[PDB]
């Protein structure tokens, strides 16, 4: 059976030539092949104001080394060992679009490797990442983020990101956003690799919701109600006041909540706004009237 | 009795084939079991919004090395030496499912090793740790939060999680949770080991929070007064106005306070939005009948 | 005199075998004592919300070590030395019940060593410590937070911390928080030595504070003068609905800044509920004698 | 085709006599020529209040050295390596006058070195800069915002910024600014090397924004309206206090958002305090003639 | 001219017996005079609530090496070397009274050395710095803070501070304080060295702020006038409430912005106190003569 001083052995006669800043193929010409997994594990929060989404990964990446190679036969079977994360040529994947929030009690700082030569390399990942965040359909709205890889610095003819593998690991149920992260995609060569997965986002329709926007609507009824009022009832110029103040507090409260930087603002926002135009004018009627 | 000569001889000795990334084990097919202590201190906070938990903890980690032992006899009776964190094996035992929060000045950087081989490592953690905050009993709620801890990259057959034993440490006293952490898990083994311990978390019903609460049930009686009141006393429009404002409000208030991440909604809100539509039925009704 | 080749001689010579991981005495079973001066700076803020104190103090730490010594005669009276503070043992004590935030760039790196082993180790130190604040008898409150030292890892029979001696060095005057940190205390043996300095904070009557308790109590006189009002003045429930809203807003406003954890709630805001509850009650008079 | 002992013989022979901390120049009266490249990639967001702006970039950084060269006939057609970024001299490029929040995790720590002697140095950069924000023609306003660059410590006869050419690389559409960074400078020498990237920021008017103006606008048309009122319709002095309360809110409400750091004020909001004051001298001329 | 190979020779000569924790002093009874400078180059804020104020500077430290000199006829001319910050003794100067939050990415990491031992050591530092901010003639206020220097460990016979050389670079103009940073101070002695620069703050008078003072000036008119008013008006307590309303907002809104450590209140807010309870005067004589 395979012990301590046999892995010993291996290792010592593994690093004994290995330089980690040389790639490692043994022709320079060709390329290296890197495949990256992501397994999306929660959805935090999706900060609107921000434009940000903050999530926790599981981001891996699997390629081949020609030079850390063994037949296991001469080393009493040892298929496989684990090596420091900083001994080792690491490709320099990067979350190109994302301020990443990891601390180094999440860094593994460690690898697997067989004797084939392929390496896995997985590392937990919290990520602040920039989304597009178009509000235009609140509070039926649908969102689109894409997550960002990009080696950093070798060009297409020395690294490539192969393909990305994106899934959804089901660690926690969010009951807030639907998300929809699966598929496979190849990467992109554009003078550097690169690629993204798309994270699709629907707000689930919760009771909580719409019993905060059944206020809203009975106060629109009303609006309606006092705009078909008699204007000699005698209270028009009253409750109008009331409500129209009742109502700007409602536009500046979502004011503050709602993104200001969406392709088309809300709807509900801007019904809202028309719904304190005609507030408007039934108090310029009143008026008109009562001095009339 | 042993001397500072003694403790370095034995350390030379201790360590001169020792390589920090091979696991501690003469056959390499047997797997090292870890026992993880986890001793709560402090329940900071339990952020709702953020659906996270602050806490202070004392992880402790023991597990068996094969390499590291002697005869105290051969070296004046010294039965256990302190070594540096970084210069053993160390199981990659990490917050799983927690943003691990801790400073550098709070890492022991050390750690006790018996004669036997039984190593203890002990080490304060601060954690914010996601927790499903579910506020539908609010405010007479009960809340459970797990605690996760997961070996990173070794699997089941190199490392395990053999118990957890977590436990309260009675450090100070909280006064607004009831803590019940205590027992003892296995750990669970599905392709790498993990083991998480349940925190129940019970509101503690203070003589403040009813305080608050009684300007709500007294404004559900004067709704209630005010909907009974006759509709040609003259104070009906009026009061009703002024109710529905303060009830906006109260709801407003609640509202930016409540979780969106829920369960169910919190049963108080709910019935708070009932009584802002009771109150809208009485403004109808009272509208309505001063035009006829 | 003494010149720059003895200190350096002095120092090859003093370092020649020194284990910085090896516990500085010549026979093992001997204990360290330390001795820990704890001199409170300023004191920035008492967060009541979040339960802490942000202070900035210094802690000095002074033990004995009995392998660095020499004879001052027989290197041209060199007294002193200064060693960097990674290259000497030094005992783990911790700021176990805070949370460090000070820098790198406030950490020393550096400690005093005499020629008879008496090592000087002085660090600033920004804290952010946990206390149990009482708004009882709020805003003529009193409050102690303990700030507590306790040896990280070493077991009673290797480290132990001799005394705490704690005092105010009255850098700067605060103006808002009448401090009382002076005495001295020796450690408590449980398993681990720790000792902690009791901090008493009394809030200082400013005349800013009282000027803001002002619009409360002439609101009180307001309420009680209304309740007083004869039922048939007409105005009773104008008033009362008025001043209803107002005591309502200054209830959420303390409410929103009163502590959530206390021992006891503030005698101040269950007056102010008491003040609401007792409009409520005029409110609940005045409808009914106008239905009447 | 060139092999892995290839490179490292290359590399081994290169680094022979490199000292990281001489400028790389064989006669040191010559100053190295630094040109930057700047390409901004999004423009997170404009903070008013706090007078900063935050983006992401991608410094690039090219200069000569003259002990890096080789024959690339001599290594089988070798024409260029890949070395870590602290084992190289690297010019102190600061950036001078901004808060640099960029991680460890952002950092490439290599460079791309060519026969030639032609190192390039790309790297990503988070910056929260500096920017003199003028409020006065908001919403319609544009801005300046410079983004400097400044060599730390070496002397313009030491190292020269040579130009500083930016560009928008166009990552991501804004919908809330538009950016206008293109240009070449060269470098300004006064006693240390520096030179800036003029920054144009126009806010685009947005459908949302002229919605929220919309309340304001027919807010001052009522104003008018109760200003040309009769003084005896008996309603004046009712929607007067009613409308400066509104009026108030706005102000308080603006005030919070404005940045009170300007050349001068927005004319919008001087034009709503205007509006309070004609509001408050419409009360005035109310209550006269009502006393009156 | 001087090359490469002469820096070369120059370096290895000069730090063959160099020791990084001896003072550099041939005879160690003589101090080393340090000779700090401080040029401010922005004030981002003056943080009221946190008594903090935020400003970058460009800190350098100037002293003289006895060990590190050569004749500059013996090595081709070279006057002047550069050397990593970490090879060389470095007085261990700290911002006292200050949380320093310079990145790592501000570290120079580098010094200038001359012939004649004569070492600048320039560094950019943001600092967050105490200060005693007294609001008490708010909103023409002056302010004078601080900015402390004090040498870590050494006694004054070792290290001192023999001066403080203060000056603003006018890098960017403030439009909001007056700043006046000039003048040089010798080095205080008492047990150990430190110095300070006072930095006086002057409020400038902006229309934007006079603009914010108009509603309260008119605000106090409206209560004399209504103060003056008949009883027998009809309006009386109809107004009063509304602006007791009024004030009351307004009193809370400056409550939660002036600071709560001064040395006295600021006037004006004392002067709004007032002008509510000249109000609550007015509203108790109103509904005293309508009872009566
Ligand atoms: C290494 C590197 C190269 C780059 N090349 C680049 N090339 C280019 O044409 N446009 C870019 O925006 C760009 N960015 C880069 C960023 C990095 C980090
Ligand atoms: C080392 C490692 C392996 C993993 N395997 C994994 N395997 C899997 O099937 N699902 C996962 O989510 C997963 N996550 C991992 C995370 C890490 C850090
Ligand atoms: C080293 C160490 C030992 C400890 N023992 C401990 N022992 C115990 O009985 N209760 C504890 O809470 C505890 N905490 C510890 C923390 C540390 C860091
Ligand atoms: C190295 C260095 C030199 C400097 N010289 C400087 N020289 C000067 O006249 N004014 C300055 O503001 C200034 N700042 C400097 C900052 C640094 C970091
Ligand atoms: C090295 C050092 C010595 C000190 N001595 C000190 N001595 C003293 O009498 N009062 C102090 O507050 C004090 N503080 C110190 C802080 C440090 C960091
Ligand atoms: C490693 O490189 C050295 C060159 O110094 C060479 O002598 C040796 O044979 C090489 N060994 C292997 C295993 O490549
Ligand atoms: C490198 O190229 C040579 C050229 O013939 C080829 O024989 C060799 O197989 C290549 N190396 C690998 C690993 O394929
Ligand atoms: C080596 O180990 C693998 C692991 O299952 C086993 O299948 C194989 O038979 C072993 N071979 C030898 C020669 O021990
Ligand atoms: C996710 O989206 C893809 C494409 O947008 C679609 O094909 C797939 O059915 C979706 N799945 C779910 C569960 O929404
Ligand atoms: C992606 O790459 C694979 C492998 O070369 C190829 O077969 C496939 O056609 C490519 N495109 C897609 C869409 O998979
Ligand atoms: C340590 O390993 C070396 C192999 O280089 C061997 O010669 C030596 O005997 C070993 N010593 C012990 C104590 O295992
Ligand atoms: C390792 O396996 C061998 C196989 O027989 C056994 O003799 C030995 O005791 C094992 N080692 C340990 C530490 O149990
Ligand atoms: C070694 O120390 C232990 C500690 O209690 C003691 O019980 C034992 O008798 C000692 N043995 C010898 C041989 O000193
Ligand atoms: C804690 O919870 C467990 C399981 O829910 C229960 O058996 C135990 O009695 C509880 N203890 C306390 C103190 O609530
Ligand atoms: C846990 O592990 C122990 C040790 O093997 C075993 O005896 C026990 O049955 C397991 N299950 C539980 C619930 O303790
Ligand atoms: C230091 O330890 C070595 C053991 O290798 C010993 O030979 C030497 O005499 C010791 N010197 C001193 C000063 O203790
Ligand atoms: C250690 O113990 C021995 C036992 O007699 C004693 O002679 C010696 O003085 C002790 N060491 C010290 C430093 O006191
Ligand atoms: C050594 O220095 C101290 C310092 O004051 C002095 O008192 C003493 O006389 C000196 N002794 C010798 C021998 O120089
Ligand atoms: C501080 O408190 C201690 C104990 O409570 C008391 O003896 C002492 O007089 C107090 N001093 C001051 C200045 O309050
Ligand atoms: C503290 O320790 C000292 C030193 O042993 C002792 O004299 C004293 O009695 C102890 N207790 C107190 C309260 O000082
Ligand atoms: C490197 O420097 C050494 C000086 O120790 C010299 O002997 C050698 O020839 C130099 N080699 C090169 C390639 O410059
Ligand atoms: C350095 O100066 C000498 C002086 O003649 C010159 O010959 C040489 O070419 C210069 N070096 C370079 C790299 O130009
Ligand atoms: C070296 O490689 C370049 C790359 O295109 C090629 O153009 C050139 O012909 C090659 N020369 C030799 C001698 O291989
Ligand atoms: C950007 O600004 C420059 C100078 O201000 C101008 O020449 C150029 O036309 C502008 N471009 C755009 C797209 O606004
Ligand atoms: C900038 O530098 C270049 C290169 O020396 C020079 O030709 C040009 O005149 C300089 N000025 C401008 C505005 O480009
Ligand atoms: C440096 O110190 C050593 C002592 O080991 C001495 O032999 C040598 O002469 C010294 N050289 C200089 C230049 O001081
Ligand atoms: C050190 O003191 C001696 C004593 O005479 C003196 O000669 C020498 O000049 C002093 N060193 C320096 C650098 O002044
Ligand atoms: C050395 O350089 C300085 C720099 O200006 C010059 O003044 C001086 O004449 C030069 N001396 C020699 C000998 O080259
Ligand atoms: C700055 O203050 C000093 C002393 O307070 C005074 O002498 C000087 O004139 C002032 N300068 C300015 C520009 O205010
Ligand atoms: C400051 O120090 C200098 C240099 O020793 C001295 O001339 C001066 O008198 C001291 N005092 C002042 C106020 O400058």
């Not at 301020?99 to 392929?118: A, C, I, P, Q, R």
């Not at 997965?197 to 009771?207: C, E, I, S």
């Not at 209270?235 to 409260?253: D, P, R």
Request: some cysteine; glycine content about 4%; hydrophobic content about 40%.
């Amino acid at each position: 059976t395979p012990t301590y001083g046999d892995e010993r052995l291996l290792r010592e006669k593994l690093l004994t030539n290995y330089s980690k800043s040389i790639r490692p193929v043994i022709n320079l010409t060709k390329v290296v092949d890197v495949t990256a997994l992501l397994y999306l594990q929660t959805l935090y929060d999706l900060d609107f104001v921000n434009n940000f989404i903050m999530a926790r990964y599981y981001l891996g990446l699997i390629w081949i080394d020609e030079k850390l190679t063994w037949n296991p036969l001469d080393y009493n079977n040892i298929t496989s060992i684990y090596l420091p994360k900083d001994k080792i040529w690491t490709p320099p994947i990067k979350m190109c679009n994302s301020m990443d929030k990891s601390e180094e009690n999440d860094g593994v700082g460690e690898l697997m490797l067989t004797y084939t030569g392929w390496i896995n390399m997985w590392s937990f990942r919290l990520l602040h990442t920039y989304c597009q965040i178009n509000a235009y359909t609140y509070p039926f709205d649908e969102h689109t983020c894409e997550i960002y890889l990009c080696v950093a610095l070798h060009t297409i003819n020395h690294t490539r990101i192969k393909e990305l593998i994106y899934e959804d690991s089901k660690f926690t149920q969010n009951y807030k956003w639907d998300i929809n992260v699966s598929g496979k995609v190849n990467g992109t060569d554009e003078l550097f690799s690169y690629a993204f997965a798309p994270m699709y986002l629907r707000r689930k329709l919760t009771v909580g919701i719409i019993a905060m926007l059944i206020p809203t609507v009975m106060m629109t009824i009303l609006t309606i109600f006092v705009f078909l009022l008699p204007p000699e009832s005698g209270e028009k110029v009253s409750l109008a006041t009331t409500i129209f103040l009742s109502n700007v507090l409602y536009l500046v409260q979502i004011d503050k909540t709602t993104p200001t930087n969406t392709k088309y603002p809300s709807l509900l926002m801007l019904y809202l706004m028309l719904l304190s135009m005609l507030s408007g004018i039934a108090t310029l009627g009143s008026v008109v009237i009562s001095k009339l």
